[PDB]
Scaffold this active site. Structure first.
Site, PDB file in Angstrom:
ATOM      1  CG  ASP A 181     -13.227   7.775  -5.443  1.00 24.33           C
ATOM      2  OD1 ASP A 181     -12.404   7.415  -6.303  1.00 24.33           O
ATOM      3  OD2 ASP A 181     -14.209   8.512  -5.749  1.00 24.33           O
ATOM      4  CB  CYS A 215      -0.669   8.135  -6.583  1.00 29.31           C
ATOM      5  SG  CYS A 215       0.461   8.700  -5.229  1.00 29.31           S
ATOM      6  NE  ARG A 221      -4.804   6.014  -4.058  1.00 26.54           N
ATOM      7  CZ  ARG A 221      -5.835   6.400  -4.796  1.00 26.54           C
ATOM      8  NH1 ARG A 221      -5.791   6.241  -6.109  1.00 26.54           N
ATOM      9  NH2 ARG A 221      -6.899   6.968  -4.219  1.00 26.54           N
ATOM     10  CB  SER A 222       3.753   6.761  -5.260  1.00 20.50           C
ATOM     11  OG  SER A 222       3.016   7.156  -6.418  1.00 20.50           O
ATOM     12  CD  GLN A 262      -0.819  11.102   0.706  1.00 18.99           C
ATOM     13  OE1 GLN A 262      -1.356  10.288  -0.061  1.00 18.99           O
ATOM     14  NE2 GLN A 262      -1.010  12.390   0.605  1.00 18.99           N
TER      15      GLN A 262
END
Ligand SMILES: Cn1cc(Cl)c(C(=O)NC2CCCC2)n1
Length: 283
Positions: A181, A215, A221-222, A262
């Protein structure tokens, strides 16, 4: 510089935030006018994440052709990817319309439906064989065929039917279920194992349309997934693998979608994944 020793040099000097901010400063800025039209407000999950006009995927529809999705076309590596946000309640039909029209074989999902106690994307595929889904706005039917649950990821076989023509296709759903998370994984081993399973399926290969990867926003994440894949492919193709510059590859990908990777922690994790992955390819 090479990668593994540039890596330790940034760790010892603690300068990951400064490296990452340089990338943000140099990244491309292109218009995203279609994304910001008022009629598309409920088609965007986040107001600050939009596809560029020049690389956006168009739906084959004359009313409204907009979806929050971008074509990342890597010329030297000879790989293409579609990066998109997690589908919203009012875009699940558009999502499967795109998969159909672009002739994709595989969908890669890097998030859970609920994370941090909030919904990160719609439940856009069926969970039981006998309970199929019909998307009336785009005239598609989606059936769960089989499901294989492993410790770090799940693979599903799905049948997508175009109800206008009665044509059917098999779609593979690759679901990485264990990204934490908060933060990034401690080791890249399970993420790399997952990438290799996607590769082995054919979903990334030129005989199919581009893989669809998402994502929640479709940039973090992508971005890590396609950056690692492309860097490892280039290390296999070139005479000198130490010439592959992950920062330059990332800036190339950011010509096609804003914001890929990010955080500085995601940047460091991408380096780690490529470094470990390059040893396994050979050993
Ligand atoms: C997948 N792959 C293939 C090769 Cl080849 C490499 C690699 O990085 N080799 C390094 C050895 C020390 C300097 C370059 N990775």
């Amino acid at each position: 510089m090479e990668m593994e020793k540039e890596f330790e040099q940034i760790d010892k000097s603690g300068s990951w935030a400064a490296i990452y901010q340089d990338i943000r400063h140099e990244a491309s800025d292109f218009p995203s006018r279609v994304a910001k039209l008022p009629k598309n407000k409920n088609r965007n999950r986040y107001r600050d994440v939009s596809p560029f006009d020049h690389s956006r995927i168009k739906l084959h529809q004359e009313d409204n052709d907009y979806i929050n999705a971008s074509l990342i076309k890597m010329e030297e590596a000879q790989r293409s990817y579609i990066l998109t946000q997690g589908p919203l309640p009012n875009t699940v039909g558009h999502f499967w319309e795109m998969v159909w029209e672009q002739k994709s074989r595989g969908v890669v999902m890097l998030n859970r439906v609920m994370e941090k106690g909030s919904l990160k994307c719609a439940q856009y595929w069926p969970q039981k064989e006998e309970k199929e889904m019909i998307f009336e706005d785009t005239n598609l039917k989606l059936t769960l065929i089989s499901e294989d649950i492993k410790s770090y990821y799940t693979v599903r076989q799905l049948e997508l039917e175009n109800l206008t023509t009665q044509e059917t296709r098999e779609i593979l759903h690759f679901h990485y279920t264990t990204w934490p998370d908060f933060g990034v994984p401690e080791s890249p081993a399970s993420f790399l194992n997952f990438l290799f399973k996607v590769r082995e399926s054919g979903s990334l290969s030129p005989e199919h349309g581009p893989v669809v990867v998402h994502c929640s926003a479709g940039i973090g994440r992508s971005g890590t997934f396609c950056l690692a894949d492309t860097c490892l492919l280039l290390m296999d193709k070139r005479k000198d693998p130490s010439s592959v510059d992950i920062k330059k590859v990332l800036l190339e990908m950011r010509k096609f979608r804003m914001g890929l990777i990010q955080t500085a922690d995601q940047l460091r994790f991408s380096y780690l994944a490529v470094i470990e992955g390059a040893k396994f390819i050979m050993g």
